[PDB]
Structure formats: C-alpha cells, structure tokens
Amino acid sequence: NHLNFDLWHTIREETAAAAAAEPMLASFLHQTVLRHESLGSVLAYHLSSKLGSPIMDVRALFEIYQQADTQISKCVEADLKAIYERDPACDEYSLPLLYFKGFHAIQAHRINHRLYLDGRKTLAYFLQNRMSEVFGVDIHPAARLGYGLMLDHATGFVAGETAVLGNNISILHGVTLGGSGKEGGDRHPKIGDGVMIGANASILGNIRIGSNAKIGAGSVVVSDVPPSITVVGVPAKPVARSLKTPSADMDQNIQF
Amino acid sequence: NHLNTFDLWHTIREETAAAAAAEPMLASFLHQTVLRHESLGSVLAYHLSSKLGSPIMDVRALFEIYQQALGSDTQISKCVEADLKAIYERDPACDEYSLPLLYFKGFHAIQAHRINHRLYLDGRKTLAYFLQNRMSEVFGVDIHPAARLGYGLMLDHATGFVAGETAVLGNNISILHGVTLGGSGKEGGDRHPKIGDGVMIGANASILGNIRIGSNAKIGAGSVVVSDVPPSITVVGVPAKPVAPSADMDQNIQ
Amino acid sequence: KNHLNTTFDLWHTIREETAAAAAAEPMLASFLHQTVLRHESLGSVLAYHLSSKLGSPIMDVRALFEIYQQALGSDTQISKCVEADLKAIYERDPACDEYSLPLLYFKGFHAIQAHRINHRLYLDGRKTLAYFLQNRMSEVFGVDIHPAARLGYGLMLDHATGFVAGETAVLGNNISILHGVTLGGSGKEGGDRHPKIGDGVMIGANASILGNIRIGSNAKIGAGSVVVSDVPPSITVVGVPAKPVARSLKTPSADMDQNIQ
Amino acid sequence: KNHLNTTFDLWHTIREETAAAAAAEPMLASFLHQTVLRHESLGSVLAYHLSSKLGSPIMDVRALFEIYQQALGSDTQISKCVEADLKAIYERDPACDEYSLPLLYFKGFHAIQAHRINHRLYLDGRKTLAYFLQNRMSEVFGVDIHPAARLGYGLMLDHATGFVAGETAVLGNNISILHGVTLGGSGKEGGDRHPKIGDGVMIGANASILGNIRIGSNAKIGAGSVVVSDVPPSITVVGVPAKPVARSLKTPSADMDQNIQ
Amino acid sequence: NHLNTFDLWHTIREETAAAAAAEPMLASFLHQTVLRHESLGSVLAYHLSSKLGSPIMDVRALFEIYQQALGSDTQISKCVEADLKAIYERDPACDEYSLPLLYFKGFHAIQAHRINHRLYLDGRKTLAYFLQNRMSEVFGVDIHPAARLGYGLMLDHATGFVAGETAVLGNNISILHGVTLGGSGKEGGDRHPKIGDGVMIGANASILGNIRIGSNAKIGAGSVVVSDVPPSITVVGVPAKPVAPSADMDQNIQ
Amino acid sequence: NHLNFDLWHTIREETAAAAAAEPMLASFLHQTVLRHESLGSVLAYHLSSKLGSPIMDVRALFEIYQQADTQISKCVEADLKAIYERDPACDEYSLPLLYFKGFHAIQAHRINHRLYLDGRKTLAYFLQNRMSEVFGVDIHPAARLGYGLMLDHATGFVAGETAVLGNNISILHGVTLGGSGKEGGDRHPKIGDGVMIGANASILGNIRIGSNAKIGAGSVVVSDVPPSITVVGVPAKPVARSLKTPSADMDQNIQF
Ligand code: NA
Ligand code: NA
Ligand code: NA
Ligand code: NA
Ligand code: NA
Ligand code: NA
C-alpha cells in the first residue's frame, strides 16, 4: 500500500481482479474503471452515473465533471488514502472509490464548489439537491473543504454555506456543521486540521473548532473549542485533552 | 419581495426565465417544469411527480393524481405559498423563491405529504402508503399520511425527519433535518407530539409520545423531549430540561 | 384474524390483503399482481420487490431477482427470519395493522431483509457484489449495514433512515430499533469493534452505541443516548454519555396483576 | 352493438371494451386505467397514448401529452377525423372487431393520428418540433409522413410498416392503404411533386405512386404497382409500371341484385 | 456444427464465452443473457423480454410471462432449435449459432410470435394484441397471433414482414424482409395464404388472399401472387406468372 | 449555402436559431450541437443518443463513436451536402443531421464498418441489430459505402456482407442490395458512381451496376446493368439511357 506507490495502478489491479471474480459486474468495472486512463476520468464517470437523471444527462454531467482545478484531483487522492488509513473496513483503495457514499458526496461537492465559484449557481443548486437525494448528504456549494477528509457512512451529513473545513478531518454520519440566525454572513463552523467528529454531533454557529480537537458522538457544540481538546455532551463541555504532546507521552522509541 | 412589495407566481417565473437564460442546459427543464405552466400548483404537481415517479407509478400517472388532489382542495396551494414565503424569510441561504421550489428536499417532502394527506383522508390508503415509502426513499423523509401539518412550515435540509400517525403541527414552525416527532407504546391512539405555532426545533432533536409543545417554544438541537413543554420555554439536553423563535432561528443552547 | 388469535397462514393472509388492495386501487393493481399475486411464495415476492428496489442499469433487476431467489433457496433460515420480522412489526408498530404493509412499503423491513441476503452473498465469497449492494442499500434506503453484520430474527427497524451497523456488529433476536441508530465502531484497527446486542433490547431514535461493547438482554437504550460502555441486562440507560437510570422490566411481583384469564 | 346497427356512443363503447379487458388481464389493468378509463374523452386518451409512444428523454411524455392535448383542443376537426378513422378500421379490417383494438394496438392508426397533430404543429409554425416528431414517428412506427402532407378522414393504414408520404402529398377521404406504400416525390426541385389521392381509393401493399400525379376517386392500385402517371376515376391499375387493367366498381346495372330489404 | 458432429446449447455457450472474453464491455450482457442460464429456452425468454419490455409491461413481468408460456408448451423451444439450425444452414452471413439468437431481428420476431400464439390460444387476446403491436414497433414485423408457423423457418433481415390472421406456414420455409402474407376482402374467414414446406420467398414479394403455395415453390423477389402456385413452380412478376429452394436460396428470377 | 463556406458554422447558426424558437428543444440542441466543438463530436453524441440501450451505455457508445479513420468525417460532410443538393425537403444542413433516419443509419454503419474491420465483430453485430431495430435499416458491417450517399426515408433498406457502393449514389427506402445462394464469397451487388435507385427496388446477387445507371422504383435486378442505362420492371429490363452526353444534348451555354 501507500504506507509501505502508484494509487491509480493499484486501483486498476484491484478492479481487474474484481471483474474476473464477478461476471455480474465485469462490464460495469470495465466501463467505469478499466477503460479509463486516469483516476479523475473514472471519478467523473462514476459520479455522473450516480447523479445523472432525466433532466441532467449522464453524458452532459460526465463532460462537466471531466472539465472540472487540478487541485481537486490532488484532494481526491488524499481523501482515498485517508480512508484506507483510518477506516478498518477499507483494505482496498477501489472500495471507497466505487462504493463509499461519503467519498462520493465529498468529491461531488468539490466539483460543485468549483461550478459555484465559476458562477454556475443554478447548476450547483440543482446538483446540491441531487446529492442530497441520492447520497443523503446536504453540502452547500459555497462550503470549503480541505483535503484528506473522510466522511464515513455519510447519511445525514449537513454543512452550510459558510462552513470551512481544514485538512485531515474525520467525520461520521449524521454530523451537522450548521448555521444560526436568519441573516447572511459567517454563521457556520470553521473546523481546524486533524479534528475528529463522532456520529450525529452538531456544531452550530460561527464558531471555531481548534486543530486536533475531538467532538464526541452526539455532542451539540455552540461555543469555540480550543485545539487539542475533547468535548462531550448536550451542550458539549471540555472533558479531556484529545492528543498527548511528546513531552507528556515520554515515548523514547527512535526506530521508525 | 413579499416583505417589500407582491406576486409570488410572477416573481418565480421571472427568476426562472433568468435561470434558463444563464444555464442553457437546464433551460428545457425550467421551461417544462415552470414556464410552460400557468399556476404554481401545476408546477408543484409536475415537479413532485418528476421526483417521486417510478416504474410502479410513472411520472405521468402521478402528475395526474397530484393535479387532481390539488384541484380537490385549493387550500393546499395556499399552504404551499405560505411555506415558500417562510423559507425566504427564515433561511439565509434562500434569496429567491424558486430555489426551495425546485431544489429544497424539505420543501418537496412537506408538499408531497400534503397531497398524501388528502389522498389518505379520501380513503386511498394503499396509494398513500406507497407514496409515503416513495417519499422516504427519495427524500429521506418519513411522514405518516395521517399527520396534520399547518402552513408557513420550514424543514431545512430535511434528511432523517420523521413524523408519525397522530402528529399535529401548527403554523409557522421551523424544523431542521434529523428531527423526530415520534410515537411511544405499541397501542393505537394519540401517541405523537402536538406542536404549537412558532416553535423552532433544532437538528436531530426528538420529541416522543403524546405530549404538547407550547407556542413559541424552542427545542435545542440534539434534545430529547418526553414531557410537555410550556409556551415560550427553551429546553436543551437528554432528557431536555427548561433552561431559558421559528422566525429568529437562533440555534444557541448555552 | 391474525397470528395472535388464530390456530393462521401468513402468506395467504398477505394474498388476501393484496387482492383487496388491488380491487380498491386500480392505479396499483398490476404492480400488486406482478409483485405479489402471480407469485407462489412469500420468499419469491420478497426477492421480486427487493430487486425492484436495488436494481439499476448496472445491476439488471432480473439478474438480481434470480440471485435473491437462489440465495433464499440456499438459506431457508432467511425466510423464517422474514416471517418472524413481519409478525414482530405487526405486534409492535401501532401504524401496522396489515402484514403486507411492511412487506411492500416499510423501508426498514426492506433494508433488513436485503441485508440478510447480502450477508449470505458475503459468506459465499461474493464480496464485490455484497459491497455493491451495501452501497445501493445505503443510497436507496438510507441504511448502511456492513455485509458481515449478523442479525437475529424478530427485528423491527422502524422508519430506518440513518441506521448504521458496522462490520462486527451482532444483533440477537426480538430487538426493536428506531431510525438514526448507530451500531458503530471505534479505532482504526481491525477485529471486534462494534456492539453486540442481546435479545429483547429496544433502541430509541438517534441513539449511538460505539465500540466492542455488550448490551445485555432486555436492556433499553433511550432515544438520543450515546453508549460507550457495556450495559447489563434489564437496565435502562439515558444521556450523553449514557448512564443507567432504571430497571427496564416490571416484574409480576411488582405489578400484582391477579388476572388468570 | 356497433356504429352500423345502433341509433351509438363510440367513447362509451371503448370504455366498456376497456373495462372488460382490464378485468380479464390483470397484467394490463393499470395501463388501461391510466391510458383510458381515468380519462374523460377519447381525445385525451389518444393524446396520452401517442405521447407514450413518441416521448423520449429529450421530449418529456408529460410535455408532449400537454402539447397534443392543446393541439386537439385547438383543432376540433382532428378528433372528428379520429372517430371516422376508428369506424373505417372497424368496417374494413376483418381483424378488427372492437374499437379499442386499433386505438391501443394498431401502429398505422397511431401514425396517422400522430401526423394529424404533427400537421397542426407545423401549420402553427412549430417546424423544428414537427421535424423532431416526424423523425420519432419514423423510428417508432416505421412510418415517414412529412408534416406538410394533408390527410382526409376515414383513412385506414393497415400494418403501416414502410409507409412514406412526402411534403406535397394529399390524401382525400375514405382511403385504404396497406403497409409499404409510397406516396413519393420526383426531382430535386421544390413545389408540387407528390401524388394527390382521391376519395375511395384502395392502395395495395408495397405499391409506389411517384410524382405530381392524380389518382382519381374510387381508383384501385394493386399491390406492388409502380404508378408514374395520372390514374382516372374508377380504374384499377396493376404492374411495374402500372397500367389500367379493369374498372374498379361493379355498377348496380351489372349486378342485377333485386333485394329491397 | 450440427451437419458435422452435436450439442446446440453447449456450442452457443462456448461461442458466448468466447465473445465475452473478446468484448469486455459486452461481457455482463452475455453473462446475464446467456451464460447464467441453464437452458436455451430461458435465454430466449430473457432476451425477448429485454427487446419487448416497456413502461406498460417491464422486462421482469414479460420474462415471467415468457418463461411460463414456454414451460406450457415444450415444443416451442423445439421449433426454436430447428430455426437456429435452418439459419446456420441457409444464411451465409451466419457462421455461429449464437449470432441469430442474439442479433437477428427476424429470428426474434418469429420466436416472439410463437409465444404470442400460445398466449392467444390460451384466451389472452388482449395481451397478445399488446405484444403484436410491441413486436411491430420494435422489430418492424407484424404477425397476427392467430397465424400458424412451422419449424425450420428463416426470416432474413425481417423488416416489413407481415402475416395475417389466417396465414399458415409449413416447415423449412425461407422468407426475406418486406414479404406480405396478406389478406383480401373485408370479411372474416380464411383469407390469407397457406405456404407449403420448402418454399422460398424473395424480398418484398406479396402473396394475397386464401391461396395455396405448393411445397418447394419459389416466389421471386418483388412478385405479387394472387392465385395458387403448384408445387416446385417458380413464379416472377406483377402479377406473378410461372416461368420455371428454401435450402438453396437462389434469388435469380431471370 | 455550399453551392454559392463552413458547414459546421452554418449548422451552429441554424441550431442556435432553432433553440431560440423552440424552448422544448433548447437543452437538447445545446447538449447535442452547440456545446460541441466539431461536427464529428455532434454526430457521435447524437448517434449514441439513438442507439444507446441498457446493455450499451450512451457514454460508452459516445466514447467509441468519438474514438472513430478521419476519412469517415469527410464522408459525413459529403453526405450532408448531397442531401442538401438532392432532397427538396432539405433546405438546412442541420435537418438531416438531427432528423433524417437514413443519414443516421449510413453514418452509424460507417463507424460500424470501422469497428468490424478492427476485428470487433461481436460489437459490430450488436450495433447492426440495434440499427435495424431503431432505424429499420439492416446494413451488414462488412458492406463498403462510398461518400456523397443519400438514403432518403430509409425504412426497409438492406445491404449485405459483400455489397460495395461507389460515390454520389442516391437510394430510396425499401431498397435491397441482396445476396443469392447459401455459400460465402462475393454475392451482393456492386454499385457504380452516380447511380440512382428508386423506392422498393431489389438488386440481387454478385452483379455490377454501371456508373450513372438508374434503377427504377420497384425493379428487381438480377443481371449486370451497363453504365448510363435505365432499367425498369420485374425482372428489370433496359428501357432508356439515363443521362445524355454533351454530344447528345448540344447545350451551347458557356456562362456558368
Ligand atoms: Na483501513
Ligand atoms: Na432568506
Ligand atoms: Na401493530
Ligand atoms: Na372489422
Ligand atoms: Na451459414
Ligand atoms: Na434541398
């Protein structure tokens, strides 16, 4: 794997094996993965498969997705490696690529965010709605998402217009990065690097979640959370430090 | 807008013609869903049937059923208009009336339910149960056809909303995704919440049993409410306790 | 007439309910005839309806139907679980007064039975197919159950939306679960890491049960609880985090109900 | 009972035939209820069924249905032609013993009525739409009729496959046409260049009638003929090229049929 | 092949596995249509239902109807096998048994008709009329369900073929596209041709009325036949005249 | 027009006008024509729209059609100009491109012929069948078709495995270029340049049709036809010269 490497080449090897083992899916795997020359082309194809509709032709969606910021494709690879690292249900890179709804919703949003920043708001709203119907995930096209993100299970995830997510964040299903008040402007959470958010937690308002903080499942967070702090409860309260500094751990290993 | 000026239908058409001009690949969708029609109700029946049509019941048949149900009770479309105005007022992500009309899952689920409720009360329970399941699959929203919903309702995001058979909702209520207006016990009879006017319910809160929520109460996100809530009280926690609204949408629970 | 007051054919009662619905609703008559009345068994009906739900251009409904039919034929315990589930929903859900209502229209019943077949496909080594269907189930039903999760009989998953059960989750028999419930994992390592739920448990809406913990038989998890430690039998737990707050059962010695009829 | 022996409601007879078919064939009951029985008029049924045939992802069936309904409402002569056609098929086709059979299942009847609406759309200036539908008709029905072609009432196009009628073709009333017939043009120039067919004509299978020629009333074109010159009334023509070979009608003075009952 | 060796079903599977290996985007189609099945009849029911399925009657329902009809008369599949062998023998464009099975419109129309005929004789006339129209739309072939077809029949290209209510076809007949076995008159009763064994009919020929075509006659392309044709006679022209066969497929008319 | 020129540019102008006049079709015209950069890309898109099916994804067909011999695209343009010239029902180039089934069947065959020559016979047979179902046209993938062809109406056209067509030929619906005998090898007609074939004519066997010959509608041709000859009847017989030499016509015009 990538921790001991060509991601695209490994996905091709996993997929050709799956196609050989499952004749039911051979032509799906060949048309979605093997006939393509790059991971980005595969992703555009598979995402258009998911979100295409009578209104929005899969071919038209596929072309738009292919035409979409080479930074997006760098985030995609980081996201895939993050899932491999952090999700014990994932032992193959092609498993989230083809079958993890939260991975799909994140990458669909990245493209949606580009279309929205390009001024194609009606199209982005149409696709925001389609993502919510098909993936059970509602991300406002203006939300800004860093790389190395994992959205495990995904169902019920909500992130609003002014939400900002840093890098290497892990999020469970049912999580809300929600707004407060009836006025526009900054009103959704900003999440620092390294944060973990447990299932069905809510983070509400224009509050900051510090780097490497941990939000326990079921928490309702309505105030800032300092870096390296764990919060729990309804409403959420600091209960522990989420990570130990080297000076606290005193780990003397120097091998690796 | 409706707070400044106002013709809701004409504003929607003007917004839609603008969208079609800007996004030519959506132009025919917008012309067929909105601009070719002559009333808001016909647009709603068309768009809802596009969402919920399936092999079992195709978009054409559902369109005719929806037009017939709307025609049988002209007040449904009145609640539709009130809901659209409520979303415009209360949701800062909404600056155009046609945005919830066309793209907000919670708006579609609520109006789909109003038609289901009409069909159910007409005695068409099997059809209403089919459509309840269809709404749950497509929108992620489970509303029993017997539930009674007022006007000026906003269901933001919508995913995971549940309201059961004996639930009753007043007017000008605001609800977030994940909210449960759920039952208790294995017996029939009144067993679901009754929600007063002006109430706001935060994300993933649950309200369970035959209990009353007083007018203008606020249910904090993540709250679990199992007993009556007096008017103008704010409750937070699991179980929820009084500690301190559909118009203001303030989500603070501290 | 029902399974609680008649010495009772589930399949024939479902056929009779369906013939009645078809005569009352011409809009749905041919669906009911193709999905229910033209079939010879409840298992064939279920395989047909489920493949209708999860089929796609990728996965032909006819092929899925045959796969589901063969899987039901390969593991006849599944159909017995199916029957127990329908009776459980009839017994416990006051919105259910007919057996064909959950069979045709309750998404939580569909997701459970789709998983039972999915689990069989997984055990037979069709893991790619099982992962494809896990994803399809999550999309169509809003329910994410790992194919390796183990589910007993007499289960009710009411409303269903948002239910999650992970790779090493185990559910016993006669369990009742509301929408939004999580039987979730902890940590980045493989091995046993999801809850094991004993017989008779009730789990309320949007509760989360996390880690390799045991929920004892007849326990009750209140709506919205977050459970991160073992829960002993016959205990009710509430809160975030969840704490024991009461005994879950009323003993006959406490009730003093003297009826013998 | 029918239109030849009852002083007769076409629409209500069609409803009665359809209710009978729906009760006998549960596979088709909901189609018959959605296509026929839930409607209030034959024109609404026709618009619904035709849009089912010619609709596509490009052209939403619901939009086409409304366009066809408005076109039928804009030109109430079309529905009168529709009724004449159904009676003509009942009278002349021995395979037809029920009025709803061509209405629902005869491709030549569908193509003719689709053209009548197509012609109206063309005259109103919706030429792009009419060309789109001309192509759709050719694909789905195997029938190519230019939107500018003019068709009278009481027409039967039996089997239909391969029928072609070009831009300046004109068909009178009470004409019978078999599959494979061509009312075709000649030359690379615009202007009148297709046949004009008089009342009462019969045209046999795979005949071709080419150029700006006139086929006189009550003429008969035998199957397989190629007609490139005018044909006078009451004449039968046969061959490649076609030549007059007989008189097409038996006069009462020749038959000497003395019945007065 | 069946003239050299022979197992038709096994040869079809071997051909199909070869095709799937060569054309990976068709592999799942071939596995789902052919290789997953255990008999030729089940493949035919599956593939015909893929062709004729529609919103009114979906591929699944038609598949079950077709399997039931085939199961009710095991001789249909016998005629299917004879037809496939006839096409292999007589059509130089056919060097594999699975090519007509999967890709020849005329083969599909004929087998679709055999099922229609069974349904029609069972009394399911409405369903048979629906499928007759469906066959006409999809295949360009109009065969009345009451028509009687023998075995070893080949309909090459098929487009425009018409056979009416009282038509009767013998065995080992070869027919090209555009051929009419048509009626005459406005009255019921026998009014369509009866075709003897071994007859060959060229492209776009018509045979009209209650007339008999003798065994091994040859009908030239473009012929119009309105009276009986004796056995082993070749006729050409409009109207057709004797001037001088399903195995040899010689199209000369001079 | 091209007789008094950019074909692709004229089609774009015709199509933008049609889109402006017909809101029902605006997004179809935009997705099929206007969003593309070349006529070949439009043709690949529209053909895949016609022949796509559940088995054969429109995206997969579109990619294959786009990947398909830059001579094919030259024939396409010649075919479009031929229809404009010869068909009085055609006064716009985009009319046959989008709505003439015979134009579609010919171009679909050209691509099919390339796939077949590349050895993808199963795919070509699949598409031959699909063309026959959707267009009512049966052309064997091995048939070789020249440029400047017009197939007017198209329904019932049949051309077999060894048929060869030259350039600037005009063919009506119902025409058969058919084989004879049960053996392989050359057994279908070879059609010379400039030929016209009328409706429902049949040309059978390994016979040669000479350049600028004319086959009357309803003819059955079973022997060679010399250049510049018109044949009529069942069976067909020479009846006239089809074109006049300059020496026969004595036209003295020298203007144009
Ligand atoms: Na992992
Ligand atoms: Na607003
Ligand atoms: Na119950
Ligand atoms: Na009749
Ligand atoms: Na052969
Ligand atoms: Na022209």
Short mmCIF file of C-alpha atoms in Angstrom, two decimals, chain A residues 55-56 60 64 120 122-123 125-126 129 132-133 136 138 156 158 174 176 179-184 187 200 204 220 222 234-235, chain B residues 19 23 25-26 29 51 89-90 92-93 99 103 105 138-139 157 159 177 203-204 221-222 237 247-254:
data_model
loop_
_atom_site.label_atom_id
_atom_site.label_comp_id
_atom_site.label_asym_id
_atom_site.label_seq_id
_atom_site.Cartn_x
_atom_site.Cartn_y
_atom_site.Cartn_z
CA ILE A 55 -33.11 16.36 -16.53
CA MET A 56 -29.31 16.02 -16.35
CA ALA A 60 -23.55 16.07 -20.07
CA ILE A 64 -18.82 18.81 -16.99
CA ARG A 120 -22.92 28.42 -12.28
CA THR A 122 -28.31 27.28 -10.61
CA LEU A 123 -26.42 24.20 -11.79
CA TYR A 125 -28.05 24.17 -6.59
CA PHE A 126 -29.52 21.52 -8.89
CA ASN A 129 -30.32 18.81 -4.39
CA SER A 132 -28.97 15.25 -1.08
CA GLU A 133 -31.50 12.92 -2.72
CA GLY A 136 -28.45 11.70 1.82
CA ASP A 138 -26.52 18.18 2.05
CA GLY A 156 -27.48 12.83 7.32
CA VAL A 158 -25.09 18.64 6.59
CA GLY A 174 -25.38 12.46 10.90
CA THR A 176 -24.22 18.89 11.28
CA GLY A 179 -25.89 27.81 10.86
CA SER A 180 -27.68 30.04 13.35
CA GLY A 181 -29.84 33.11 12.77
CA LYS A 182 -31.79 34.45 9.79
CA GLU A 183 -29.08 36.77 8.43
CA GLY A 184 -26.39 36.09 5.86
CA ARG A 187 -22.59 31.71 10.56
CA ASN A 200 -24.75 12.62 14.99
CA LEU A 204 -23.73 25.25 15.26
CA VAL A 220 -24.02 19.73 20.47
CA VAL A 222 -22.30 26.05 20.33
CA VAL A 234 -25.57 18.28 25.18
CA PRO A 235 -24.41 21.04 25.32
CA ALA B 19 -32.00 30.92 -14.70
CA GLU B 23 -27.80 27.88 -17.78
CA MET B 25 -28.54 23.02 -20.44
CA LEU B 26 -31.23 23.50 -17.75
CA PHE B 29 -36.06 21.53 -17.65
CA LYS B 51 -39.17 13.39 -8.08
CA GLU B 89 -37.84 34.85 5.45
CA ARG B 90 -36.12 32.38 7.74
CA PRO B 92 -30.45 32.99 4.92
CA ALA B 93 -29.35 30.58 2.18
CA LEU B 99 -34.76 27.96 -5.09
CA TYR B 103 -34.16 22.37 -5.16
CA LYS B 105 -35.71 18.46 -0.37
CA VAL B 138 -36.26 9.64 -2.47
CA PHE B 139 -36.24 12.44 0.15
CA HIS B 157 -32.07 20.06 4.87
CA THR B 159 -32.76 14.32 5.84
CA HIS B 177 -33.00 17.71 9.49
CA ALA B 203 -31.16 19.44 14.28
CA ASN B 204 -31.57 15.80 15.37
CA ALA B 221 -30.51 20.68 18.74
CA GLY B 222 -29.93 17.16 20.00
CA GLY B 237 -30.41 18.17 26.81
CA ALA B 247 -38.69 33.39 12.92
CA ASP B 248 -35.32 34.13 14.58
CA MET B 249 -33.68 30.68 14.04
CA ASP B 250 -31.14 31.14 16.85
CA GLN B 251 -29.53 27.75 17.48
CA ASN B 252 -27.69 28.62 20.72
CA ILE B 253 -28.38 26.13 23.51
CA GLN B 254 -25.87 27.52 26.03
#
